[PDB]
Amino acid sequence: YAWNRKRISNCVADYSVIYNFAPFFAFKCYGVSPTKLNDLCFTNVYADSF
Amino acid sequence: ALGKLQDVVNHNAQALNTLVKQLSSKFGAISSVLNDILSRLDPPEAEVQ
Amino acid sequence: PTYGVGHQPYRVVVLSFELLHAPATVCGPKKSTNLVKNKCVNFNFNGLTG
């Protein structure tokens, strides 16, 4: 009900480490490829945790 | 006076413009740019887009 | 803890992005290359390839 939202901005993101150590049974992406995240630039990045 | 000839010229230009305009249409896909689709998706779903 | 799978607590994190509609502040690890003028090149500017 009170899910935490964190803004991510002004950083360079290495998504490779998320793969390198992972306890995540489900890693499902809808609008972007998982392997292509390293080659792209983004804004309006938000992480919602619950 | 010379409306008929100009009209023909207008139609041809208009047709080309419309065809050019059609490149900016998503057509039910995530993006209208092929390069973005290749850069953002894996081949099984990129093929669909 | 005694319950089986499907009722156990699961932590979910949702990453939300926007695609190319604003200036980007979050980018991948890819290294910047020098700029070349008056030649046909395949360029990647902020995840936009042309």
Distance of alpha carbon C38 from alpha carbon C36, whole angstroms: 7
Q: What is the 3-state secondary structure (H, E, C) of A2-44?
A: CCEEEEECCEECCCHHHHHCCCCCCCCCCCCCCCCHHHCEEEE
Is C20 in contact with B39 (Cβ distance < 8 A)?
Answer: no
Beta bridge partner(s), residue A8: A45
C46: which 2 tokens? Answer: 């902020």
Among chain A residues, the shortest Cα distance to C19 is held by A42
List C-alpha distances in Å: A14 to A21, B27, C12.
13, 33, 20
Whole-angstrom Cα Rg for chain B: 18
Closest CB from A10, A13, A48 relative to C28: A13
Task: Give contacts of A11 with chain C, Cβ < 8 Å.
Answer: 25-26
- Tokens (6 digits) for B4: 């008929």
**Residue A46 bridge partners (DSSP):** A7, C16
Q: Can you say how many angstroms the Cα of residue B42 is from the centroid of all Cα atoms in its chain?
A: 24
| C-alpha dihedral, C39 to B38 to A43 to A45, nearest 10° | -160
Specify whether the CB–CB gap between C36 and A31 falls below 8 A.
no
Give the experimental resolution in Å: 2.9
Give the residue on C whose Cα is nearest the Cα of A4. Answer: C13
Shortest alpha-carbon distance between residue A4 and chain C (Å): 9
